[PDB]
Design a protein around this ligand. Structure first.
Ligand SMILES: Nc1nonc1C(=O)NC1CCNCC1
Ligand SMILES: Nc1nonc1C(=O)NC1CCNCC1
Lengths: 237, 237
């Protein structure tokens, strides 16, 4: 397809089996729609104990990733990727990821994802080796690998063949018709496709309004959406 | 310690090896600080082909998780957890996770995390079985497992023994003293601990201001922070 190649720099490359061996992303990898290739800084060490961390200038409680093995791993990944690969560092200081940013990143045929461990990486590597810094959210994790997998999974959905509008999703129902006394909305069992579409759209608008009203502000609603949202708000009242 | 038990409902429980076998979280599991226990809806099916998906009332392109195997898995997890376990559903319709929300969730000694696959789960299960709905971010993934791991990793950092303020982190430097012509800030090599603290704090304030100014609004800065931020903004200008 419009396949995608993703190079990964990580001290724990076996974590990536979570996305390359299972589910939709695992199928994408098996079918060569997505290729994920990993380089481990530990393999670029030269000392007997394969040291991959180092002490921060200025002191402090934590450790940083050691520059030489990480730099060399990045350079090796860049040589494999050839031309046009954007190098991304995952960190809380990066641009916050949202679906618009996923769609942007998915325009790349090649990406290299650098996964930090310990307290961080040297600022000068960010300056010299990293094209873009991205955050998956405003919380603190133990490593960049889950953010990198999250990003891979989100962009993989855009690859042709991998899968078979600003608003939260509508409620979904499946069997049984009655579950702990709770019935399926009759409209969903009416077979009236236009009423079903409008009902779902109205529910998405209502849920976005009630839970995430700030998302509504960023939208230019269609006439139909304005009407259904007004109906929901009148109903709710 | 103040150990934590996390029950997980997932069609792909082997994904969780990414956090239970590696790094800081893997150590937490080995040392019994964190226990992660998984139940797979597929094991609660009764038909020959172990069906775990089902068709949405009202039609549409996708499938939902089948109610009976998922319900039964959840009930089994709840019986294992005993009293006091909060059941969390990960989805884009949930409360957006941030570090304050992580600290809240970390107050729980027990959690059960329900990981959705396909297009979603039946709304009535959310109503009847789920205590809280949380989102790890405003993007769309192929399953709830990476969000659940992300949440586990973030809350694990709060468990006593697992590890050895509103602002973005400061830059970090390690060896070598000179890297591609770029030098380490002399203050970090001065050994003056108070100047180093103030420099780091000033950098965090400057970076938050330049990259994420909306985060600054949510803070009541100390006198010292107000002064250093003013200095940074004058400097920047
Ligand atoms: N949030 C994040 N989006 O990307 N990476 C994130 C993250 O928490 N990284 C951790 C930062 C502390 N050092 C270990 C890595
Ligand atoms: N963002 C999220 N925060 O928690 N879960 C998220 C998510 O994208 N879930 C996918 C929604 C589409 N169906 C597959 C699961």
């Amino acid at each position: 397809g419009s396949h995608m190649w993703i190079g990964v720099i990580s001290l724990f490359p076996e974590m990536f089996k979570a996305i390359t061996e299972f589910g939709v992303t695992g199928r994408a990898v098996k079918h060569n729609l997505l290729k994920v290739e990993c380089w481990n800084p530990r393999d670029f060490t030269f000392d007997k104990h394969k040291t991959v961390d180092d002490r921060p200038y200025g002191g402090g409680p934590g450790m940083l990733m050691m520059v030489q093995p990480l730099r060399d791993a990045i350079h090796t990944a860049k040589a494999a990727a050839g031309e046009g690969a954007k190098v991304i560092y995952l960190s809380p200081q990066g641009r916050k990821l949202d679906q618009g940013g996923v769609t942007e990143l998915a325009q790349n045929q090649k990406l290299i994802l650098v996964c930090g461990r310990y307290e961080g990486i040297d600022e000068r590597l960010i300056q010299t080796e990293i094209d873009e810094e991205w955050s998956i959210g405003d919380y603190v994790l133990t490593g960049g690998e889950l953010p990198a997998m999250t990003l891979i999974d989100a962009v993989a959905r855009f690859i042709p063949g991998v899968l078979g509008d600003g608003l939260l999703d509508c409620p979904h129902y499946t069997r049984p018709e009655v579950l702990e006394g709770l019935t399926v909305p009759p409209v969903l069992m009416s077979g009236h496709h236009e009423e079903i579409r409008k009902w779902r759209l109205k529910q998405s608008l209502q849920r976005t309004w009630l839970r995430r009203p700030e998302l509504l502000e960023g939208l230019a609603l269609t006439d139909e959406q304005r009407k259904l949202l007004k109906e929901a708000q009148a109903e709710h009242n």
